[PDB]
Symmetry: D2
Subunit: 209 residues, 4 copies
């Protein structure tokens, strides 16, 4: 299942239908995915996750993108599914330093996946674009002979440039457009905006350096 | 603002993508407006209200069918905005059940003298909150009732508003969303006291609609 | 079980340990019960409630105090317990106009409890003081021959003036002091303050009219 | 501020009054600091941080034992405060794992050149967040490491801080709470990757402490 598909021809919402920080008001084009919708769509994701992974210890890894938020918001729901459990069950949390840097940067450095050998792994990225990053990330997590590997992602841009990666868990599948907000940033800006919006030709301009 | 518009042809979302109780998984056709979506719009709305009403003693009046939810929610956003004032300003909260029969006259017990506590409103600033306007009748009969008490200002806030031919054509001041002539349940809206626990707004199905009855 | 007892000799917290609207800063003496603690303590309450009342249709009534908040916050948790249910189960919500006004103001007016005859009832008040209100409220809800009646309350002041009412569900049992915040108000003020605090001789002064 | 103080003699709360997983209902002694309590304090703290740090590009640095929770939470309060600026200001978020052995020298791979991305910090305003300071060692070794990069300002924020004789006697800038020399778990703190799902902070019991092991 593809997640919630948003069409190419999607208009999104006027910036006025919600609360957008006034300081980003010329920088943003449209709200595409309002905060609460992400939340609910994420609640369910968690669920499809546990369906096939609850029951045994798992290792949730965060891609080091610098977008911890979604990872968090998802872990919180994965934790609330775990209480109902009858026996206690550990879970380990972590970031993967690196995502298309390779080899022996994995055999050791990324071999603290020596720690992954034999365990069930769940990788968490926020948006997937060309897929490169991720794919080069399974190659190596793979060398570790993990027992199993799933990949949840919040967004899956549909680009002619996909390099074929299709995660196991999708929240939303989007047009190929440039988004910020919620858990995506731009040069360290838009971290305080919690709806996924399209950025404007102007926004992308002034934010740089 | 027409609030967020939802054209007749909107197909919603399939049950599959959100969390829904399994016991109503047969009683619904599609997710119409998911909880969080509801939430974000309401936050906006609150700002919108205070644009107008803010800085004054506001009397928040609630129109009481089968629930409370929306109101309560909205009010948390308002309160939360009244936190920032350099001056403490009162708020008055009220509940009014009105579904008489028609009106068709009738006395003293519960009706005209429920205006006694209405003089409470007079030279006041009022905010009437409703959840969903259908025909719009209820609303229209309250303005009347209210407008007698000579209020300083009346403003109405709807979460949702249906497009229908069955409408007395009334339009709130603050609309959360304008929807198509569909029967929805969940979040704030009930059907015979069912769906109370469903958070998203959806369209019922015939089975559950026909299965939960009078 | 008495709920969470707070001692006579309780100091509470300095106003500075939390977020209090600056406009009530000379009006309040201490934070006694911070918002989140109420929340959790309420989460559990719900639970003890369902334990003995889940399973059949229930009628949750709110005392018309003019303090809807707690009632709401509790219903929301009672609703989230209901989803896990296998069969769908109705629940009806309402306020009781009146609470130590009597008689035939109950036989009809309060007889829309004719609607209560045969049903399982749950009454919700926010703070109980001398108990009068409530007690005169069971007398009449009783005339209706309800099938069963429980009474949850958020706060139970311990006063020499209790007139003996002891609710079935208690969140916190407090000294005899005058509180505001969360879901308690004073002449329509303090509705925007979400911690339960003690009011000061000054606060009670300027708020009146 | 010592944050909220919890004298050695605090007895906590019994399991009975809050929601706790049944599978840990034998592995804990008492609720020490319930989730919401945690929450309210953190909100305060955020205000406190922006008092000092606010209006500038802040680099938020996270000290990475076994979790993330507190940080994440804190940051929502900060972000939420940066919403109000008439000017958009960046934020930088970072994660630093440091638990070497001691230090005892060692090369190139992961250590000194993890300063390469530290020049990132230099003439910067820094905020180091930790969850619980015990001996205080970890903290002390970071200031050092950090202070080299010549930063414009370092400030540390702890959720909790234990009173112990085993302490290098370091004291954060922002303390959520100062506690007694007890072993706690839950909310943000884990014990061998257990208690991850417990929301309140509590004191372990011998059984679960002795039952979950290395
Ligand atoms: N802010 C933001 N980052 C994006 C967007 N699309 C892709 N990226 C960033 O560029 C990375 C490239 O991922 P890849 O192209 O390797 O699949 C993404 O992982 C993400 O970090 C976008 O719409 N906005
Ligand atoms: N569940 C639900 N109740 C509705 C709907 N339309 C109207 N009603 C109920 O009937 C009332 C209609 O009031 P009107 O505006 O028709 O006078 C609404 O406030 C609501 O309580 C709907 O589509 N769904
Ligand atoms: N604001 C506030 N109201 C209180 C307090 N104690 C009692 N009352 C109000 O006075 C009512 C009297 O309840 P009773 O005295 O009948 O038990 C309470 O139900 C509540 O509405 C208090 O500490 N603060
Ligand atoms: N669960 C838990 N971990 C602790 C406690 N005290 C210390 N630790 C862990 O060990 C670290 C101690 O760092 P120190 O300040 O001792 O250098 C803490 O950040 C924490 O991860 C405690 O009471 N409970």
């Amino acid at each position: 299942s593809p997640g919630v598909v948003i069409s190419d021809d999607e208009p999104g919402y006027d910036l006025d239908l919600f609360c957008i920080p006034n300081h980003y008001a010329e920088d943003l084009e449209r709200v595409f995915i309002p905060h609460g919708l992400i939340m609910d769509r994420t609640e369910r994701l968690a669920r499809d996750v546990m369906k096939e992974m609850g029951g045994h210890h798992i290792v949730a890894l965060c891609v080091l993108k610098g977008g911890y938020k979604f990872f968090a918001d998802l872990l919180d729901y994965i934790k609330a599914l775990n209480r109902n459990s009858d026996r206690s069950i550990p879970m380990t949390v972590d970031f993967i330093r690196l995502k298309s840097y390779s080899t022996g940067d994995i055999k050791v450095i990324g071999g603290d996946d020596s720690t992954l050998t034999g365990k069930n792994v769940l990788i968490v990225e926020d948006i997937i674009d060309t897929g490169k990053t991720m794919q080069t990330l399974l190659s190596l997590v793979r060398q570790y002979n993990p027992k199993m590997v799933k990949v949840a992602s919040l967004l899956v841009k549909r680009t002619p440039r996909s390099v074929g990666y299709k995660p196991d868990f999708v929240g939303f599948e989007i047009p190929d457009k440039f988004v910020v907000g919620y858990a995506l940033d731009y040069n360290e800006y838009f971290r305080d905006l919690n709806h996924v919006c399209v950025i404007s030709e102007t926004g992308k301009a002034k934010y740089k350096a």
